[PDB]
Design a protein around this nucleic acid. Structure first.
Lengths: 75, 73
DNA sequence: AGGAACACGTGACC
DNA sequence: GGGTCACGTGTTCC
């Protein structure tokens, strides 16, 4: 019996399904319950988040300029 | 239908795994499972920075309004 | 030598 | 049904 190949395949399959559930717990608003749809919404969620990190760190630098401009106008 | 139908489902999935590698940094020759694990870790690092940066921004916006007030007096 | 990691066809469940 | 999941199998890489 080639059994240890059948069991090893069973653990891999289990580890991945464990990961899918953890993915479902952090990605907001998924409604088609299929696996392909899950990954699709995950990719979109990641793009949206890095896009926001870039806009916020930029807005912060920009407001740091106005503060510096007004200190200079002061005196 | 039925062999062909299964190839279409399998292909739809495999396309998406590869795209996942293209949006997360440093995950090139990894396992499918470790890939999903790091995607989760990266989503967590990403929200975390959004919160921290927005905190820093407010601290600076409060400071701006104070000097605006000193300027107009 | 055998563990790891992948894609495949087939049976079953809605 | 059409569409999805789980399973054992065949393969290749160290």
């Amino acid at each position: 019996e080639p059994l240890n190949h059948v069991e090893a395949e069973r653990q891999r399959r289990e580890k991945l399904n464990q990961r899918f559930y953890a993915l479902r717990a952090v990605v907001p608003n998924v409604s088609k319950m299929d696996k392909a749809s899950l990954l699709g919404d995950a990719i979109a969620y990641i793009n949206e988040l890095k896009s926001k990190v870039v806009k916020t760190e930029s807005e912060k630098l920009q407001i740091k300029n106005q503060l510096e401009e007004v200190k200079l106008e002061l005196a």
